[PDB]
Design a protein around this ligand. Structure first.
Ligand SMILES: O=C(Cc1ccc(Cl)cn1)Nc1cncc2ccccc12
Ligand SMILES: O=C(Cc1ccc(Cl)cn1)Nc1cncc2ccccc12
Lengths: 305, 300
């Protein structure tokens, strides 16, 4: 019993965190094989950030301008290239702690663990979801740029996020490991705002199933709904549309608890229109949307790595 | 910006998780140097759970009765001893991944990260607080026994908890790494119930300071309170008494935000009276009590 916002064990990722310095800027890098990946804005000055030409800024740099530190060992940079918004620093030493890994781009609603780092040193691990507006509600301070988001599938670390910036609302923006930003964001010091956020409906339903598995049933009702009537309700309360794909993904949880997905949707519909009425679900007075259906199955079944 | 329930990076602890088997029972062990620590109930049978005589059950065991597996490598048990409710299995190999570590016993209200494990394999990491009733609200299934709670402060891993059991309410009970249980619990299947749980007041105040640091001030008021009047009100909402020690501990946050502890106490009194009225504090519709004053300063 119990249900916590649980992150993947971060060990395989901690072995990859290095410190990258370029002039006065110091941030984090991900050392995989003989390449260190970090945000390309590491080559910028505060003036350069206002309107940067990264090809022009990078062409002026030499390998010795990038100081890479893996623990208390300096790694020598033997090459440097840019792929979208990520700088790739070729180093002389392959990371002996390189795990089995992939670079994956995730979709909004998908969750991942963030290993927050400062000066190439991991300081904390938390779980979060890629919001439908492509931001993440992280916890990041100055120097966290280069911190990575990941999932662990069996023995393979799927790197899905690299932290680049904080938006004025306190939410965070970053790229996949190929340097492609999530969302309509650019790595420039300018006016950028995240779009209006929505609730990840499939994730709320997954979390309602987790509450049922944990003995919290007060919100269940005798009712069911059509997928179209539920989506008309979801659209009204800034909830993401629930697709037939989502209904299929919730199938195992529906079979385990004996509550059909559209029956759980009628519970969610009632919760949206009436509220919790002084009650809580899994110790929460809000509907939690940062647990995917896979996270719920994984946690309520003990999958190890 | 942002405020998350953040756990410590678990790598230093993952390198210590091993699987311990005794007969039919399989649980987790913590391999530090040449010793594997695990709950002593690993030696118990089916009818030896209500009133186990651990000294009697352990005297009947030999080293070869304990199978210890570190990854895909079997470790050879060369000794076994019991220290309170923890079994210490001396092995023939020192763990090369042993970090700098300490065994620390924590007080209620303290937080720690839990590395949940099954069959010596880490499956997830989450942040917990030791409840005032000495239980933890963890997320654990069968086979999680032996999973550990820890903090990492300046490269050193302070192990503070080893999971032993789940109480009938779904909350968890365990020991420090010296085998001393937290709370009035025993490692027997006898009827055991946690005392009524209360809110960790100092932690709620720390979290209100975190919200102020993050730009949220809607809940602040023009009132102050005496510590005694605060405690008389807070006690009625099942909040822990706030001691002068707690007021002192909140001093740095009070100085950083410019809000005196007793002024913040008056906001808390008002929040308990009014609720949130549709508002949230740091994305939460409830008052969060699993962030200590130290966690707030560290994260902000
Ligand atoms: O935002 C930047 C630096 C930066 C990078 C790119 C651009 Cl376009 C503009 N600024 N770093 C930070 C990242 N995350 C949280 C942060 C909290 C506080 C301060 C700095 C934080
Ligand atoms: O509580 C026990 C078994 C046990 C150990 C020691 C003593 Cl004295 C009595 N019973 N194990 C478990 C631990 N944590 C979560 C659990 C969820 C579900 C099932 C079993 C769980």
């Amino acid at each position: 019993s119990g249900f916590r916002k649980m992150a993947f064990p971060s060990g395989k990722v901690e072995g990859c965190m290095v410190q990258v310095t370029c002039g006065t800027t110091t941030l984090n890098g991900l050392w995989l094989d003989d390449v260190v990946y970090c945000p390309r804005h590491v080559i910028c000055t505060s003036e350069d950030m206002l309107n940067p030409n990264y090809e022009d800024l990078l062409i002026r740099k030499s390998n010795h301008n990038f100081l890479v530190q893996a623990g208390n060992v300096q790694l020598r940079v033997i090459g440097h290239s840019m792929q979208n918004c990520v700088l790739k620093l070729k180093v002389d030493t392959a990371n002996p702690k390189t795990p089995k890994y992939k670079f994956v781009r995730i979709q909004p609603g998908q969750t991942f663990s963030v290993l927050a780092c400062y000066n190439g040193s991991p300081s904390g691990v938390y779980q979060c979801a890629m919001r439908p507006n492509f931001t993440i509600k992280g916890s990041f301070l100055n120097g966290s740029c280069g911190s990575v988001g990941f999932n662990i599938d069996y023995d393979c670390v799927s790197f899905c996020y690299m932290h680049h910036m904080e938006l004025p609302t306190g939410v965070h923006a970053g790229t996949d490991l190929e340097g492609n930003f999530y969302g309509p964001f650019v790595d420039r010091q300018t006016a950028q705002a995240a779009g209006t956020d929505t609730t990840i409906t499939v994730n709320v339903l997954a979390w309602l199933y987790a509450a049922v598995i944990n003995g919290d049933r007060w919100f269940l009702n005798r009712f069911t709904t059509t997928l179209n009537d539920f989506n008309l309700v979801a659209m009204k309360y800034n909830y993401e549309p629930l697709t037939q794909d989502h209904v299929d993904i919730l199938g195992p949880l529906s079979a385990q608890t004996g509550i059909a997905v559209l029956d759980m949707c009628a519970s969610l519909k009632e919760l949206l229109q009436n509220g919790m009425n002084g009650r809580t679900i899994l110790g929460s007075a809000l509907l939690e949307d940062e647990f995917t259906p896979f996270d719920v199955v994984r946690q309520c079944s003990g999958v190890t790595f």
